[PDB]
Design a protein around this ligand. Structure first.
Ligand SMILES: [Cl-]
Ligand SMILES: [Mg+2]
Ligand SMILES: [Mg+2]
Length: 213
């Protein structure tokens, strides 16, 4: 049973707290259930690379942002390109509760517009890490912009790259989101600009380290 093993990973390794628990419950009741193991991995990766400045695309109720910001130093910053207006007050409340609201710079609005502004700014090539969880049709655009935005040696992370297994399912034909993911996953395999690892965790997580050239 894969369900019993997934339950065991959560029971035996997730370091939860009432802030994270409440945010997952509140998000579940809105009109995907948050996988806590993924936020915890993101926090570990931030610490492992000694990240100080990170980029996020998606944000939603701010769970990944909260995990990321808690792993940063006090002077650390997250530029959070938020695609959900409806939920900013939720995200803000949990960031304030955790004492990290001052580390998070919210950029609400179209992701393409935000990333174009960032590439055309002093922020280009300064990010230690970028985390992308957004509309799958746009992943190639987000990846290409993250590659310009992160420093050499920086880490790009694309979430949900396994898309409920649809990428592997031969019966899924004519679906724009699945086709876009199949294209970007295939492109990353042979992209000499990065080191790659695709993880099965929480609906797939692709790690791409920008090579120094
Ligand atoms: Cl390298
Ligand atoms: Mg996100
Ligand atoms: Mg995932």
């Amino acid at each position: 049973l894969t369900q019993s093993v997934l339950q065991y990973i959560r029971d035996s390794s997730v370091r939860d707290n009432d802030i994270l628990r409440d945010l997952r419950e509140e998000t579940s009741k809105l009109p995907m259930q948050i996988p806590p193991e993924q936020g915890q991995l993101l926090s570990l990766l931030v610490r492992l690379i000694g990240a100080r400045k990170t980029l996020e695309v998606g944000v939603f109720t701010g769970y990944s942002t909260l995990c990321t910001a808690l792993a940063l130093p006090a002077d650390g910053r997250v530029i959070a390109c938020d695609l959900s207006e409806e939920w900013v007050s939720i995200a803000r409340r949990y960031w304030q509760r955790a004492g990290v609201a001052d580390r998070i710079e919210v950029r609400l609005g179209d992701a393409h517009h935000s990333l174009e502004a960032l590439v055309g700014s002093e922020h280009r090539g300064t990010f230690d890490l970028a985390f992308i969880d957004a509309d799958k049709e746009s992943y190639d655009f987000y990846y290409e912009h993250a590659l310009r935005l992160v420093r050499p040696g920086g880490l790009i992370i694309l979430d949900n790259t396994l898309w409920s297994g649809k990428v592997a399912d031969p019966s899924v034909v004519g679906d724009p989101e699945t086709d876009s993911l199949r294209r970007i996953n295939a492109k990353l395999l042979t992209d000499e600009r990065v080191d790659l690892s695709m993880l099965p965790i929480a609906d797939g997580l692709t790690l791409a380290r920008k090579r120094k050239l």
